[PDB]
Amino acid sequence: MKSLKGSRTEKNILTAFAGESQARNRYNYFGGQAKKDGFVQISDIFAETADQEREHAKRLFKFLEGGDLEIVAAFPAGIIADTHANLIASAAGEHHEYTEMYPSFARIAREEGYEEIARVFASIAVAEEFHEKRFLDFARNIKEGRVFLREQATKWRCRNCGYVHEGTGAPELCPACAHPKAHFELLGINW
Amino acid sequence: MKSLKGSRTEKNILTAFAGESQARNRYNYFGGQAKKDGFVQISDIFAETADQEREHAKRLFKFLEGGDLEIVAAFPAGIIADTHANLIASAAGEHHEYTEMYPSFARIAREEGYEEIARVFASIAVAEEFHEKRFLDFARNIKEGRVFLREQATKWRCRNCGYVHEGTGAPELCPACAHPKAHFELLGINW
Numbered sequence: 415m416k417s418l419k420g421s422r423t424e425k426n427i428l429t430a431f432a433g434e435s436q437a438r439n440r441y442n443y444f445g446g447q448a449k450k451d452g453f454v455q456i457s458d459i460f461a462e463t464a465d466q467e468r469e470h471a472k473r474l475f476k477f478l479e480g481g482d483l484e485i486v487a488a489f490p491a492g493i494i495a496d497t498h499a500n501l502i503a504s505a506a507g508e509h510h511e512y513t514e515m516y517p518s519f520a521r522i523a524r525e526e527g528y529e530e531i532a533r534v535f536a537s538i539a540v541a542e543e544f545h546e547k548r549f550l551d552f553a554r555n556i557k558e559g560r561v562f563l564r565e566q567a568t569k570w571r572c573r574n575c576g577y578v579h580e581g582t583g584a585p586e587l588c589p590a591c592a593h594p595k596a597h598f599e600l601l602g603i604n605w
Numbered sequence: 606m607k608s609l610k611g612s613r614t615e616k617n618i619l620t621a622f623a624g625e626s627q628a629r630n631r632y633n634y635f636g637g638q639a640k641k642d643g644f645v646q647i648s649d650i651f652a653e654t655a656d657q658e659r660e661h662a663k664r665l666f667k668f669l670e671g672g673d674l675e676i677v678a679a680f681p682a683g684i685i686a687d688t689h690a691n692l693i694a695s696a697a698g699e700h701h702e703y704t705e706m707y708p709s710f711a712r713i714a715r716e717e718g719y720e721e722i723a724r725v726f727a728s729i730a731v732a733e734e735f736h737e738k739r740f741l742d743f744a745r746n747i748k749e750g751r752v753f754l755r756e757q758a759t760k761w762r763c764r765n766c767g768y769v770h771e772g773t774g775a776p777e778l779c780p781a782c783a784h785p786k787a788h789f790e791l792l793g794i795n796w
């Protein structure tokens with residue numbers, strides 16, 4: 415790694431920075447619509463994904479040493495729909511990104527002598543693959559009615575107050591904090 | 606349920622509100638010390654628990670219809686230590702609460718004709734039991750060196766950027782966002 419200035423990798427980094435910046439915003443707006451649709455756990459994962467996009471953008475932006483730079487590129491023009499649709503559009507763009515755009519960008523960085531940047535573009539691809547995965551399972555539970563209803567009794571946690579509930583479905587109201595079903599999630603352990 | 610004024614349940618609600626308010630603060634301070642100790646996932650669970658305490662306090666506070674009211678009660682006087690110790694003090698107080706204090710308070714509410722409040726005190730007890738559980742497993746992994754090291758290869762997620770890593774231990778540095786190991790957690794699915 416030399417200088418980036420004038421290289422193709424230089425425009426590739428700005429282009430990625432540009433689509434990741436917009437993605438932060440759309441995930442943030444999709445999070446607010448999810449909360450409105452009554453899926454608090456899905457709202458918080460949009461917001462988490464938003465924040466992780468900010469951090470992919472920041473590692474990238476830091477490679478730039480430049481001034482003003484012109485790019486040609488395509489981006490979704492809209493749109494905010496119902497949550498299911500939001501989760502499908504998101505997944506589709508995460509898809510294009512880990513299967514198409516970052517493999518290429520990594521290739522050329524590599525090919526221009528920037529292998530570290532190449533690493534970074536490959537590592538981000540990994541993250542976008544989990545993001546898509548997440549978005550697809552949530553969209554499938556929405557499509558199959560299993561957000562707030564499972565087939566054998568399991569335990570549900572209140573995101574708002576931590577209340578735990580043994581049942582096949584979450585309660586219509588939290589007995590502890592009196593927030594509605596929308597606040598409930600599958601209880602999970604990850605330690 | 607009548608009026609609460611003058612009842613014993615009346616002082617019980619304020620006393621619980623008082624210990625839960627302080628608990629919010631101590632969990633918030635324990636979260637900052639955890640971040641300093643290099644346990645980001647544990648930092649965020651302190652902060653989450655803090656927020657759930659706020660919401661137990663709020664359901665309670667809303668039952669009050671009163672003016673100024675005198676209480677006698679004991680509270681921890683201090684202290685902020687290392688994270689392990691923080692997790693053990695927290696668990697001990699969560700313990701006293703679900704095994705002793707809220708069972709009683711629920712009893713008397715019940716016994717004074719306030720069964721709904723009684724429910725609420727029982728439902729909060731449930732939440733505090735999961736909180737303790739959480740705190741104990743994290744303190745055990747800290748004691749056994751398994752926060753950031755497992756015995757068979759498993760996958761670790763970067764909290765900062767979503768990067769996923771297959772291995773027995775988390776990386777020393779995230780390849781995607783270049784944040785240190787402290788940001789990694791066991792990857793979990795709960796949908």
Ligand SMILES: [Fe+3]
Binds near residue numbers: 467508541542545
């Ligand atoms: Fe992504």
Ligand SMILES: [Fe+3]
Binds near residue numbers: 574577589
């Ligand atoms: Fe609740």
Ligand SMILES: [Fe+3]
Binds near residue numbers: 699
């Ligand atoms: Fe608690």
Ligand SMILES: [Fe+3]
Binds near residue numbers: 765766779780782
């Ligand atoms: Fe990372």
Ligand SMILES: [Zn+2]
Binds near residue numbers: 434466467538
């Ligand atoms: Zn990204």
Ligand SMILES: [Zn+2]
Binds near residue numbers: 729733
């Ligand atoms: Zn509480």
